[PDB]
Write a protein that binds this DNA or RNA. Sequence first.
DNA 1: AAAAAAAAAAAAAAAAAAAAAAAAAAAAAAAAAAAAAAAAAAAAAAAAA
Length: 48
Amino acid sequence: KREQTIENLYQLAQLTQQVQADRIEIVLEERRDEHFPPMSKALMETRS
DNA sequence: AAAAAAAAAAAAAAAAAAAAAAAAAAAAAAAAAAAAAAAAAAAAAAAAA
């Protein structure tokens, strides 16, 4: 009588792999299109 | 004519309620601190008197 239980767990898993893909899309929107902010030639003297 | 018995009475005792007092709690302030946000002074880079 675990039919309900397991199929319902798969139904959460099925609607939630959608959430995983949604997070991947959130990344794609958030993917940088940019790099690490550069140095100012004085932070060069400071840290380097 | 008098005694005893019987009946209609005040004083004391018991219980509850309303006045007041102190402490505690909800609240409802005017004042300060911390964090956040909007400008500013020495150093650095490129083309040119």
